[PDB]
Amino acid sequence: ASRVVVNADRVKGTINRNIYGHFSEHLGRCIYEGLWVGEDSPIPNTNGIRNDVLEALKQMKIPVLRWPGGCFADEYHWKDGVGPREKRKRMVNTHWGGVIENNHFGTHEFMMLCELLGCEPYISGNVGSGTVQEMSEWVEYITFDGESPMANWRRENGREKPWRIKYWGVGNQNWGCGGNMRAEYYADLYRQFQTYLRNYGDNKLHKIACGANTADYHWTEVLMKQAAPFMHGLSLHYYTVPGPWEKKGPATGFTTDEWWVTLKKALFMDRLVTKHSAIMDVYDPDKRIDLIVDEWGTWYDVEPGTNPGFLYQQNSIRDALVAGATLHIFHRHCDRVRMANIAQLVNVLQSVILTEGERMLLTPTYHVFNMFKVHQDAELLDTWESVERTGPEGELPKVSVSASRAADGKIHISLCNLDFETGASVDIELRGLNGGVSATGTTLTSGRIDGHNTFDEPERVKPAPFRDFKLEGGHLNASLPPMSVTVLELTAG
């Protein structure tokens, strides 16, 4: 059995709710159809945004949403997306299908979406092909409460008082699609651009510099050495890609080897965060600067017969395990990691939701985010563990476990069983509790390693009650189902 000791009276820090963040690019059907259907759509909607998706995302408690992209954000000229909707310019979505963007979803529609969702906006500005004045004017347009060409324009377009926004990304993937820049050059641009992004009124911008791709430690070193005093956060991008880029593998119908490889690569997040954080510690020992993992998740070959530029992929219990295990990694590093954004909210990459016209389904990934929402802004509890191994040559931990205490005093313990073949015995010792407790549980599992939901069968994989445990005086013994994500709730009394 795996052994876990939860020290309920020992708080290790706060799990920022933004660790549970999301990301929606103008790519494929993430924005159009996935969210924006238009006010005159036969699809039931609120001001042009489909209701089924809205309600599901509200239930999930989305904390923050990144927009309008990765790559698209460094091609975007925000002025194209404001003004009378019917008069907005077209565009060439160069990176993603080479299709035409109608700009009907723009700044006002995105702010409205965030308000409808109850989430924070995180906007990514254009460095690669934009100018300093253009980005500065966007911030002014959004946040300025006085009179000026930009503020007046905002009011004309129907938003009288300024919006508040905290998170502002000063360019995306500038080492690549954002201009193929050396770190030294981007650091100079970053320092210049950020100078002109002001705090107007009561707004306080948290300026985020473009961070490393995967294991590019040199990028982190340069950006920290050259630009630390001018940033409030530094990003990191890491996708879980089973096979070579040229042939990543399928989202469903994959082999056992692909199961193990996928989970092994997902867990590499821990090494990356650890090593990037170590460099950040050298230049920023007080940990003032956030590490922001603003693109992560699995990336497979798209579904057969679909446009590879649209990145539509299915989503299975394998993805749920990647999501659960990775979120636990963020928990462990919550002293430095204060936001993460899983790549792509709807119809794109590792989505929580997929739509097909008026129909939608919730993926196993959605269910993980919904079950784990109890960790948002929770206090991380000290836990010691000794877990059995699983997979080829015991390369994987059998179980991943995290415990937190919510503001209402309830304790949540979440556990992932990475082995698809057998259940996992976990003995959890509860210490420093004070009173006594009772427990309920919920578990997300499947009977197939590629178990997934479809439009005809939207509920093939979904949470269910979990009762296979015993709680007896300071000890909670659980038998986790194979390939499962489980959440236990302990209440006083």
Ligand X SMILES: OC[C@@H]1O[C@@H](O[C@@H]2[C@@H](O)[C@H](O[C@@H]3CO[C@@H](O)[C@H](O)[C@H]3O)OC[C@H]2O[C@@H]2OC[C@@H](O)[C@H](O)[C@H]2O)[C@H](O)[C@H]1O
Name the residue among 484, 486, 485 with its Cα closest to residue 476.
486
Helix (H, G, I), strand (E, B) or coil at 45: strand
**What are 258's two structure tokens?**
């692909």
Structural element, H or E, at residue 271: helix 256-283
Q: What are the backbone dihedrals phi and psi of residue 27, each rounded to the nearest 5 degrees, phi first? A: -155, 130
Interface stretch with ligand X, choices 66-74, 139-147, 330-338, 445-453 (CB under 6 A): 66-74
- Is the CB of 101 or the CB of 419 nearer to ligand X? 101
Q: Which residues pair with 452 in a beta bridge?
A: 316
- Is the CB of 173 or the CB of 355 nearer to ligand X? 173
Interface stretch with ligand X, choices 225-233, 343-351, 454-462, 469-477 (CB under 6 A): 343-351
Name the residue among 280, 270, 379, 292 with its Cα closest to residue 340.
292
Interhelix angle 364-372/51-60, rounded to 10 degrees, is 40
Interface stretch with ligand X, choices 217-225, 237-245, 379-387, 432-440 (CB under 6 A): 237-245
Question: Given candidates 122, 141, 239, 310, which one binds ligand X under the rule CB under 6 A?
Answer: 239
Question: Given candidates 295, 319, 379, 419, which one binds ligand X under the rule CB under 6 A?
Answer: 295
Nearest distance from C-beta of residue 248 to ligand X, angstroms: 10
Question: Given candidates 237, 276, 318, 336, which one binds ligand X under the rule CB under 6 A?
Answer: 237
**What are 251's two structure tokens?**
């989202």
- Is the CB of 48 or the CB of 69 nearer to ligand X? 69
Nearest distance from C-beta of residue 428 to ligand X, angstroms: 36
Nearest distance from C-beta of residue 178 to ligand X, angstroms: 8
CA-CA distance, 352 to 404, in Å (whole number)? 23
Interface stretch with ligand X, choices 68-76, 134-142, 394-402, 472-480 (CB under 6 A): 68-76
Q: Is 95 in the site for ligand X (CB under 6 A)?
A: yes
Nearest distance from C-beta of residue 349 to ligand X, angstroms: 6
Interface stretch with ligand X, choices 233-241, 353-361, 373-381, 383-391 (CB under 6 A): 233-241
Question: Given candidates 31, 62, 71, 91, which one binds ligand X under the rule CB under 6 A?
Answer: 71
Nearest distance from C-beta of residue 141 to ligand X, angstroms: 24
Q: What is the DSSP letter of 327?
A: H
Q: What is the DSSP letter of 252?
A: S
Task: Print burial letters for 166-176: b (CB count within 10 Å at least 16), e (below 16).
Answer: bbbbbbbbbbb
Q: What is the DSSP letter of 162?
A: P
- Is the CB of 167 or the CB of 239 nearer to ligand X? 239
Site for ligand X in 347-386 (CB under 6 A): 349
Interface stretch with ligand X, choices 170-178, 203-211, 326-334, 437-445 (CB under 6 A): 170-178
Q: Is 70 in the site for ligand X (CB under 6 A)?
A: yes
What is the amino acid identity at position 349?
Answer: L
Residues in contact with ligand X, counted by CB under 6 A, come to a total of 17
Structural element, H or E, at residue 293: strand 290-298
CA-CA distance, 447 to 418, in Å (whole number)? 14
Residue ranges of the alpha helices (H) in 306-406?
317-332, 364-372
Site for ligand X in 25-64 (CB under 6 A): 25
- Is the CB of 132 or the CB of 241 nearer to ligand X? 241
- Is the CB of 15 or the CB of 177 nearer to ligand X? 177
Nearest distance from C-beta of residue 51 to ligand X, angstroms: 26
CB atoms within 10 A of CB 52: 17
Q: Is 69 in the site for ligand X (CB under 6 A)?
A: yes
Residue ranges of the alpha helices (H) in 19-175?
51-60, 107-117, 132-143, 149-156
Q: Is 213 in the site for ligand X (CB under 6 A)?
A: yes
Q: What are the backbone dihedrals phi and psi of residue 82, each rounded to the nearest 5 degrees, phi first? A: -125, 165
Name the residue among 125, 120, 143 with its Cα closest to residue 204.
143
Q: Cβ(311)–Cβ(446) under 8 Å? A: no
Nearest distance from C-beta of residue 295 to ligand X, angstroms: 6
- Is the CB of 66 or the CB of 336 nearer to ligand X? 66
- Under the rule (CB under 6 A), what is the footprint of ligand X? 25, 69-71, 95, 172-173, 177, 213-214, 237, 239, 241, 295, 343-344, 349
